[PDB]
Design an enzyme around this catalytic site. Structure first.
Site, mmCIF file in Angstrom:
data_model
loop_
_atom_site.group_PDB
_atom_site.id
_atom_site.type_symbol
_atom_site.label_atom_id
_atom_site.label_comp_id
_atom_site.label_asym_id
_atom_site.label_seq_id
_atom_site.Cartn_x
_atom_site.Cartn_y
_atom_site.Cartn_z
ATOM 1 N N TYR A 182 -11.640 11.641 5.584
ATOM 2 C CA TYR A 182 -11.667 11.851 7.062
ATOM 3 C C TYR A 182 -10.493 13.137 7.004
ATOM 4 O O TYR A 182 -9.952 13.407 6.019
ATOM 5 C CB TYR A 182 -10.986 10.977 7.950
ATOM 6 C CG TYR A 182 -10.304 9.743 7.405
ATOM 7 C CD1 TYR A 182 -8.663 10.214 7.401
ATOM 8 C CD2 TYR A 182 -10.498 8.330 7.236
ATOM 9 C CE1 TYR A 182 -7.849 9.131 6.858
ATOM 10 C CE2 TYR A 182 -9.500 7.575 6.923
ATOM 11 C CZ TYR A 182 -8.453 8.068 6.695
ATOM 12 O OH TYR A 182 -7.336 7.060 6.448
ATOM 13 N N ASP A 217 0.725 -1.193 0.020
ATOM 14 C CA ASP A 217 0.162 -0.042 0.198
ATOM 15 C C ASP A 217 0.837 1.098 0.014
ATOM 16 O O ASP A 217 1.811 1.432 0.938
ATOM 17 C CB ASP A 217 -1.003 0.030 1.101
ATOM 18 C CG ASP A 217 -1.813 1.326 1.315
ATOM 19 O OD1 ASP A 217 -2.625 1.570 0.440
ATOM 20 O OD2 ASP A 217 -1.544 1.922 2.427
ATOM 21 N N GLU A 225 1.428 11.139 0.919
ATOM 22 C CA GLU A 225 0.708 12.208 1.296
ATOM 23 C C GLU A 225 1.586 13.505 1.130
ATOM 24 O O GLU A 225 2.316 13.918 1.815
ATOM 25 C CB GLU A 225 0.458 12.180 2.836
ATOM 26 C CG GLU A 225 -0.666 10.772 3.092
ATOM 27 C CD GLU A 225 -1.027 10.599 4.398
ATOM 28 O OE1 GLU A 225 -1.251 11.681 5.225
ATOM 29 O OE2 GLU A 225 -1.765 9.588 4.846
ATOM 30 N N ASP A 256 1.148 5.001 0.656
ATOM 31 C CA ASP A 256 0.402 5.968 1.210
ATOM 32 C C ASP A 256 1.114 7.575 1.249
ATOM 33 O O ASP A 256 1.629 7.901 1.991
ATOM 34 C CB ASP A 256 0.210 5.965 2.656
ATOM 35 C CG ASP A 256 -0.949 4.780 2.785
ATOM 36 O OD1 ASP A 256 -1.643 4.316 1.884
ATOM 37 O OD2 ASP A 256 -1.338 4.434 4.120
#
Length: 540
Positions: free
Chosen positions: A367, A288, A292, A290
């Site tokens: 979120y 995965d 950001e 991620d």
């Protein structure tokens, strides 16, 4: 007559194919992948003729043979498959073979083949669900959660997930490469130690003690080779063979290295290190990413470039190529996922309509829309829809899904995010019509572990009583609690807002739900994720 019956010598019976150096802090020295375990066995013969050939058998099959030359002997040999074997020593001559009683030997490997299944009871409010909807039900487990949060892999309600993501695997690099870690005390320096002698842009393990050495349920013996989170995760895969356990690379403070991967020298080194990582740690089922975030506006204010979109797409294509090659080498299916911003401002920096062809799942981070990082503009942090007082709200779950759909992303790729925490403010004031979200704040709510962020367990356990108001906003599909005298305002997901997201997933034919972070739930959020996606109560 056949030889006397040999006695297996007392000795070490625990061996490993991937060896872990117990006095090594550098990841390069920590783990050594061999092609086979080096096994040794000795024997004595207390009565009789020693025979003329000695053999070591594993489940009746010869692993070693040599001349029997006196009353004691030793055999050294290789075992290339993990598991538990019934090992015998047999002494043979022309008149027959006489076998010792069996001694079990343990041959460790990082698929957990040597481990008992970690099949632990559901804790707190977690109730059993069958993964029979066909929908993703994911959650993150954080490496550092084994310290203060005291939340270990044996506490994960693993039967209630399809996907378990491990946050986070770091990319090596010092100054200018992982500067976002320097905001966290000792964090940068811990990665440099782990990465000593290791090239920048290769993956490593950020905290080797938590990941591999800390004693945990099922992996407490001193000579158990893999302890910590990785050893428990191996045992978890033995209990749950269809659970997908993915290493997640990046997150808020370990995403800086992705901004350099427009250099294909660096990107190729990273992808090769991911391949090596998954060849090393066989319990992981893919990767995965991620990052950001492509374009910046993550933790580091000095990174982000217009090329990041292109880099993101190349990176997925190349990771998929590597995982497809690993898949046909192993016969296994490997997954490539990514957690991505849900703001349309960030979504449209990437061509996800192109990237999706390389990806199994897109974890939409629906979120952190609002929170104590902005004290002026308050709002629901993880709502489905805009609220009635601000119907033009940009950051909502539906707008992030819609941005992806507007690019051409297939709906089945998109997994919607649920929060097992609240974000909040203190001193909220100057709001109209009893809606605290039309006011402004003076600072962050006092969090559970860090400012402005509250575990859902603590919202339910402490902030749903006394002076706290509870409101369910049915337009936004979002709960919030408000303490009028201190101006404390917390915005979170509850069972009902999770139910609205899960119904929305089924209505729109989306891929499922995932959550951050698994230690913060008391069971209510994950139960609702499962129920709302149509998973049947019970066990299979």
């Amino acid at each position: 007559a056949a030889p006397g019956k040999p006695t297996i010598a007392w000795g070490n019976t625990k061996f490993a194919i991937v060896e872990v150096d117990q006095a090594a802090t550098a990841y390069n020295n920590l783990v050594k992948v061999k092609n086979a375990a080096d096994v040794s066995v000795s024997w004595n013969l207390w009565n009789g003729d020693t025979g003329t050939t000695a053999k070591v058998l594993l489940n009746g099959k010869e692993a070693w043979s040599g001349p029997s030359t006196g009353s004691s002997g030793t055999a050294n040999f290789k075992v290339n498959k993990g598991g538990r074997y019934q090992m015998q020593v047999a002494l043979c001559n022309a008149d027959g073979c006489t076998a010792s009683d069996a001694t079990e030997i343990v041959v460790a490997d990082t698929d957990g083949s040597h481990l008992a299944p970690l099949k632990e009871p559901l804790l707190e409010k977690n109730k059993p669900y069958k993964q029979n909807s066909g929908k993703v039900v994911g959650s993150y487990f954080v490496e550092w959660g084994v310290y203060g949060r005291n939340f270990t892999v044996d506490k994960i309600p693993a039967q209630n997930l399809t996907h378990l993501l491990y946050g986070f695997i770091p990319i090596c690099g010092g100054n200018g490469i992982n500067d976002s870690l320097k905001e966290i005390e000792g964090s940068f320096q811990a990665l440099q130690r782990s990465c000593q002698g290791r090239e920048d842009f290769k993956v490593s393990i950020h905290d080797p003690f938590a990941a591999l050495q800390k004693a945990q349920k099922g992996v407490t013996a001193w000579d158990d080779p893999y302890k910590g989170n990785f050893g428990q995760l191996m045992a978890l895969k033995q209990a749950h063979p269809d659970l997908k356990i993915l290493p997640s690379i990046g997150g808020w403070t370990l995403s800086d290295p992705f901004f350099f991967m427009g250099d294909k020298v660096k990107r190729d080194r990273f992808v090769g290190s991911v391949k090596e990582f998954l060849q090393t740690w066989k319990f992981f089922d893919g990767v995965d990413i991620d990052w950001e975030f492509p374009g910046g506006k993550g933790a580091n204010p000095n990174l982000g470039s217009p090329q990041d979109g292109e880099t993101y797409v190349l990176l997925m294509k190349e990771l998929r190529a590597m995982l497809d090659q690993l898949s046909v080498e192993t016969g296994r299916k490997y997954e490539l996922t990514s957690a991505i911003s849900a703001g349309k401002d960030k979504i449209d920096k990437v061509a996800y309509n192109v990237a999706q062809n390389s990806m199994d799942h897109i974890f939409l981070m629906s979120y952190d829309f609002y929170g104590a990082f902005d004290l002026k503009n308050l709002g629901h942090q993880t709502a489905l829809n805009a609220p009635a007082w601000k119907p033009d709200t940009a950051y909502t779950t539906v707008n992030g899904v819609n941005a992806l759909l507007a690019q051409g992303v297939k709906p089945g790729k998109i997994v919607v995010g649920t929060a097992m925490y609240g974000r909040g403010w203190t001193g909220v004031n100057g709001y109209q019509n009893n809606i605290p979200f039309t006011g402004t704040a003076t600072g962050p709510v006092k969090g559970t572990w860090e400012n402005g962020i509250v575990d859902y367990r603590q919202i339910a356990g402490q902030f749903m009583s006394g002076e706290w108001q509870y409101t369910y906003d049915a337009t936004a599909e979002a709960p919030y609690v408000f303490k009028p005298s201190t101006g404390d305002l917390i915005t979170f997901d509850d069972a009902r807002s999770v139910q609205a997201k899960g119904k929305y997933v089924l209505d729109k034919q989306l891929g499922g739900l995932f959550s951050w972070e698994i230690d913060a739930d008391n069971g209510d959020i994950l139960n609702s994720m499962n129920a709302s996606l149509g998973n049947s109560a019970g066990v299979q």
